Amino acid sequence: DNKVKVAELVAEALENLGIQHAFGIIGAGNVHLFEAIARRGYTEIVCVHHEQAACMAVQTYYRTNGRIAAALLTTGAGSTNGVTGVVSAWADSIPCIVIAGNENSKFTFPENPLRMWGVQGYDSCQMVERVSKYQMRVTKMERAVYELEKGVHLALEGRPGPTWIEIPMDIQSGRIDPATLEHYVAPPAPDYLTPAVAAQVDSVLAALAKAERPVLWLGNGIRLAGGERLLKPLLEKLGSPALVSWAGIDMLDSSHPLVFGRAGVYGQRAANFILQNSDYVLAIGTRLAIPQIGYDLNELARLARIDVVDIDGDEAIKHAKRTQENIVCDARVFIEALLARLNAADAPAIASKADWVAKCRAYEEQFPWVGAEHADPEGFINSYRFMERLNGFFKDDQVVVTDMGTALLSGHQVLRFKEGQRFMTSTGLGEMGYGLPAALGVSFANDRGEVMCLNCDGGMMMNLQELQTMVHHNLPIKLFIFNNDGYLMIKHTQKSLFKSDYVGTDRKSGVSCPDFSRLAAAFDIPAYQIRGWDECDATLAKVQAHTGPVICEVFMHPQQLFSPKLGVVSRADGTLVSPPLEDLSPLIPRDVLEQAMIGGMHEKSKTL
Amino acid sequence: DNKVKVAELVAEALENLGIQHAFGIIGAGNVHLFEAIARRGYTEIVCVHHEQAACMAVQTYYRTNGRIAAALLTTGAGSTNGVTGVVSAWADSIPCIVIAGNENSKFTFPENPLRMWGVQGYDSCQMVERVSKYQMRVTKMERAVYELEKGVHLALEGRPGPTWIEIPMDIQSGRIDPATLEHYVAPPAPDYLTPAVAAQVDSVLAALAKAERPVLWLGNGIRLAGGERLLKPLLEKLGSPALVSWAGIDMLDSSHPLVFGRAGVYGQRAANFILQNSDYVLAIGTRLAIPQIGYDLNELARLARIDVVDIDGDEAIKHAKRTQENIVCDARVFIEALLARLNAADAPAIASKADWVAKCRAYEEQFPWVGAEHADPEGFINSYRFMERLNGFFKDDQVVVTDMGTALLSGHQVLRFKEGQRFMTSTGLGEMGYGLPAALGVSFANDRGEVMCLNCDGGMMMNLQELQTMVHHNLPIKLFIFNNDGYLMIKHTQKSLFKSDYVGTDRKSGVSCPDFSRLAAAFDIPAYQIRGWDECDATLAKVQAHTGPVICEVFMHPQQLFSPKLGVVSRTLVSPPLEDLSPLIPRDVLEQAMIGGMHEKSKTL
Ligand SMILES: Cc1cc2nc3c(=O)[nH]c(=O)nc-3n(C[C@H](O)[C@H](O)[C@H](O)COP(=O)(O)OP(=O)(O)OC[C@H]3O[C@@H](n4cnc5c(N)ncnc54)[C@H](O)[C@@H]3O)c2cc1C
Ligand SMILES: Cc1cc2nc3c(=O)[nH]c(=O)nc-3n(C[C@H](O)[C@H](O)[C@H](O)COP(=O)(O)OP(=O)(O)OC[C@H]3O[C@@H](n4cnc5c(N)ncnc54)[C@H](O)[C@@H]3O)c2cc1C
Ligand SMILES: Cc1ncc(C[n+]2csc(CCOP(=O)(O)OP(=O)(O)O)c2C)c(N)n1
Ligand SMILES: Cc1ncc(C[n+]2csc(CCOP(=O)(O)OP(=O)(O)O)c2C)c(N)n1
Ligand SMILES: [Mg+2]
Ligand SMILES: [Mg+2]
16 A cells, blocks of 8 residues: 555645745644644644634745745635735735635535535635635645645745635545655746846936936835845945835835935825935835825826836836836846946946935935924823834844734834844735734744734734734744724724714724733733833833743823824815825925925915 | 715615614724714614624624624725625525725726725625625615615525625715615515425325324524424424424424424434434425535435425425425425415324324433433533533523534533523534624624623634623623633544544644633633532522623533544444444444334444
């Protein structure tokens, strides 16, 4: 009998693929895979308490060191519970693979006329068909490893994303001659630098050489491409200012002399002025999503040509009514091509941008990231000022992950990073409850390594159960929780729209959160509270010194503003106006704005 | 200006549809609907802490008093987080409506070439297309109320189930003259009693009149059809024993003289013998799912003709290789038609079933529900004996909901219900974490009424956050938690297959659970523990007397058997026939219990 269980061959393939961690929850639909993986001993299975946390954890796991991880899901609700995590990986271009069990394959076909398959199964592939790069149900034992290899390759290639491989129970427990196993051979990798694209790189260099006020806009596509180490020499060779997307913040020292922050609808004031007064914008590896560019392309960088580099052709041309060069190219290949052209025998002389760099520094001097608008409201800790203080306690290898709300906004508008530190969240889908699973993924990727998790009283509830995973494995997760009596982001939304009482956003209107320090004690997690500045520095130093898990609640004003922010504003008449991207709220005086805008202010700004 | 916000017309429509509760979480995608509903003051919005809980709570809400509820979801993860609840409602035929927000309608169409819609939207209708009865994206303001009326009708029509109506943000906030609203008019209900179906009813009645050992197998389709009050008159007019499906347990007093329990793979020994020794089985409103009939139709009730009544034609014929009459008909219509023929002046003569009824009582005498197999092991309370004791503390209008695991299995194999009491769980999908949201739904359906929630250390974790919802609204939910060091059901699965060390199922193999009494205190919930019999009755009384939420941890053996159970037995391996439940009885006892004598498979075990 020269046959081997398919499950054992799948466990071998995971080792051959370099997959050292799987996150998931057991059930009859994957018990044979749990068994095979556990007995081989190469892949560590991390048991989570909700499958959603497994499909989120794999994402930050990959982002930490570039090793893919698997989510191991069972039949029925084991699979439906993972869908939110699949969508966030899809939205943020993060590679991962889901291996989902199912009922016996005699039930698993879409022509089955019954509402459900077998005892409790369904078509888990169809459900993620539009939010994943590839789905396949293995119905032949001999193709089980083929489809895993293909799923991993397709997750990683091009614009990365999640893939979904479903293996019915009976396929897992079947036995075959290992010699009959089929294997997937990846097609040849594409050559992006075609003559057409090469000519676009020449055009970009000519524009950079002539531009007086260039701005590079650098995004996480660069890191996904493996090109972040090229950015420092690129920027210094060009003498050009750069902005970083929120997802790209950790690619370049925030204090590098040519890096000027983050622009958008929650932009920094100085960054938005730099963007909006440029004469040439080169976006590389950034999606130019709505929160980065606002709501009207004709109001974006009105004095500028805009070029865009993206490996996804649909993303590269979505702004084609506005952009000039839409460059469909891997970001690393593009930067290397541009650097080579800078050293060409016939390279153009690069005109000085010294006057513009000086103007960029003047904007930052005029508009600090933490300014008068971030005063402690009624004496409460202002979250923006808290982020600035926290920033100074970062370790040299600090990793920071965030949930949504205050953690997302104050974090990305304030925090500074240097080489060796990392910053991660889920901005594509923007789901509450990401922060804790995100911390799990980082910690396991770094062999139980330290992670700072910036979280919120609302978002803490969605995946609250993962506190048990964190304690079970004694993970050194430093979990800050911003308490502000509920859903502060939505309080502002409904107040702006209706100017009435809160609905469904605070304790009086239907939403309350527990005392997380009392919950911490129940889970055996040390806990601290920062209610004022008195205890802040000493508490932060203690939190950072902890070697295991720790919770720190931070108390802020329940109505604190998030600003700067591009918000709707009333004209003197009373008409509502959505102002141009440079005119962030709370609004600066019109005479200051006039002087900050090369051509004077936009017509919309004149009457606000 | 005679125009009105679409969101305000939606809030009016909800009132006109009788929807008094919505469960959900706010976001930009549904902020206009939250505002309109709250300002109107008819529909109470219950804010949950995970959208999955909202889509589960609406199910038990409906099942309590028959009023549909809505789930109110926002863009993006607001919608994806609901899908598990949608599938459970689909699998268990429970009507509910999801109202989901989305991005501006200029982004929301499948031909959009980008991975995501607008800021963070996706095609929420496509994602539930195979696990819901109807999905529609409202792209015209004048159709928003039409699609809600249509969605409620299609949820309740025929075989009930969830519907999914997506309303983009800009549609909610638009303004239209109310007289431009279109309205949905439901077609006339179908008439199931064609001549062909009437002839089928006459065939059933003729088989019942002649059968010496009939068994009616009654399922939740009867309650969904509104026919449960016809069952006592039917049973007594026929003199026939009945079994109830797990979902149908609460439709008839468990101690009614003609009700003999629940058969299946986790059957009661007596119920399985009654089923397996009948000469005629009439299934009404029960799916005859795999956990009910086992793994081989040729081994099911081998001496019996089997007829099936189901409103879903695919369900009615799925066993057609084995059944005789497959009747596509509403369960109430069918029962009314059968009673009309029974009460007719020309009604046929019903042969006596008195001997069979006596044989059913003897089966129950020889094989009690809680038996010697359920002894307390190694100093731990046995969960089956605990359920029997807990049963004695039920209130007169008790409602019980369960999670999976011990709560599901010990509960459905032991607990008895009287008229007025209710029993609910999710059996079609069988998802862990259903218990707490299920309890939320019942409590709000009964104006913050009392509910007993039988739960588990593993299942508690999936929707642990709803403990905050319970305390916020001070819901009198009585939450029992069976502590058994992790995933006991899977411990048995993997031990049966591999006979080695546990993997991913207990503290040492990767899965641990918190101290729920310490967690209770952190949430300001009073907490008790039951470890032995001495404190049991006093603690159960205290739990039942509390006016607000309570937690009661019950400690059981971490490897306690679940039984009786149709298990695989090593002779080579054999899956025995449904009557031959494990732990196995002696072959001579089985021989005597089987009117035919035992099956070939059983003789060698
Ligand atoms: C409420 C809210 C407010 C926000 N405000 C802001 C704000 O003010 N400013 C801001 O900058 N962000 C903001 N964000 C985040 C922003 O909208 C995006 O979600 C994202 O963070 C932008 O970063 P990115 O383009 O680097 O990442 P992504 O959106 O993930 O884009 C990465 C891009 O890289 C491409 N790519 C992938 N692999 C490669 C490769 N190998 N080569 C080349 N290209 C590749 C992908 O196709 C994709 O288009 C906000 C988010 C939210 C939820
Ligand atoms: C591990 C496990 C073990 C189980 N063990 C058992 C067991 O031993 N015994 C047992 O009985 N159950 C058992 N169950 C549950 C069982 O498999 C089913 O899930 C269900 O509980 C059976 O009840 P039902 O047929 O009444 O409900 P459903 O499965 O919901 O079936 C209801 C049926 O009614 C039909 N219907 C709906 N509306 C109408 C109407 N108006 N008129 C007519 N028909 C209508 C529907 O089409 C459907 O077919 C188990 C479940 C699990 C997860
Ligand atoms: C799963 C999910 N449900 C709903 C939303 C909509 N939403 C966006 S922000 C927000 C409130 C965030 O509250 P909290 O985490 O407490 O943060 P805060 O703004 O108060 O700092 C909600 C409900 C979401 N993003 N994800
Ligand atoms: C969401 C989900 N994930 C996984 C499963 C698979 N599953 C079925 S039973 C079980 C263990 C249940 O453990 P617990 O709730 O502690 O109950 P016990 O059997 O120990 O009483 C699991 C993981 C499931 N049904 N639902
Ligand atoms: Mg909050
Ligand atoms: Mg358990």
